[PDB]
Amino acid sequence: LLDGKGVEMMRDYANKQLIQMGVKKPETPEEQQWLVEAQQAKQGQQDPAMVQAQGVLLQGQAELAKAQNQTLSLQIDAAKVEAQNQLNA
Amino acid sequence: LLDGKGVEMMRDYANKQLIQMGVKKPETPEEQQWLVEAQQAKQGQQDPAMVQAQGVLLQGQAELAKAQNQTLSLQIDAAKVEAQNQLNA
Numbered sequence: 085l086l087d088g089k090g091v092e093m094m095r096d097y098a099n100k101q102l103i104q105m106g107v108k109k110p111e112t113p114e115e116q117q118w119l120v121e122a123q124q125a126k127q128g129q130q131d132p133a134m135v136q137a138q139g140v141l142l143q144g145q146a147e148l149a150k151a152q153n154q155t156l157s158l159q160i161d162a163a164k165v166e167a168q169n170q171l172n173a
Numbered sequence: 174l175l176d177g178k179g180v181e182m183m184r185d186y187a188n189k190q191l192i193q194m195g196v197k198k199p200e201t202p203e204e205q206q207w208l209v210e211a212q213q214a215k216q217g218q219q220d221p222a223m224v225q226a227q228g229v230l231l232q233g234q235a236e237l238a239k240a241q242n243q244t245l246s247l248q249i250d251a252a253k254v255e256a257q258n259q260l261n262a
Contacts (some may be wrong), residue, residue: 097196137203139233146233146240153244160204160251 085091102108103115104122174180191197192204193211 093191093197127198130223132220132222132226135223135230139226139230141233142237143233146237149237149240150243153240153247157247157251160247160254162255164258165230167262170262 085095088094099108099115100118103118104112106119106122108115110116110119174184176184188197188204189207192199192207195208195211199208201203201207
């Protein structure tokens with residue numbers, strides 16, 4: 085679009101929008117850190133469902149670890165049991 | 174828009190909305206701290222789904238920590254068990 089004053093603002097907004105989604109190739113360094121901030125915002129995005137799923141996952145993994153520790157502790161208590169029985173016998 | 178009295182208020186509202194939305198570049202210090210307040214409000218938003226997801230995820234991480242502590246305590250109790258068995262034998 086041609087340049088007045090408001091349409092200049094609209095064209096600048098369209099400039100920033102096109103640069104920020106990677107569709108445009110930045111030339112001027114202003115566009116360069118515009119893309120830099122867009123990439124930073126992209127890298128700092130996360131959804132609640134993913135976080136809840138990850139929480140459930142490491143809960144389950146910890147309960148797996150607890151089961152394995154139960155195996156180990158039961159085996160060691162068994163070893164103590166046979167040792168005590170041999171000492172008594 | 175040209176200026177009367179009410180349309181002056183409407184144009185001032187449009188000024189504030191455009192500045193606070195990052196589309197316009199502030200010139201006057203009034204617009205400067207308008208943008209400052211807009212940025213402060215931007216830094217102070219958080220959604221309930223994010224906070225709930227963080228709560229579940231962090232519960233899971235700490236229960237992972239609890240599982241690891243269970244590993245450590247069971248191993249140490251095992252060491253005590255072998256020490257006691259050696260002392261008895």
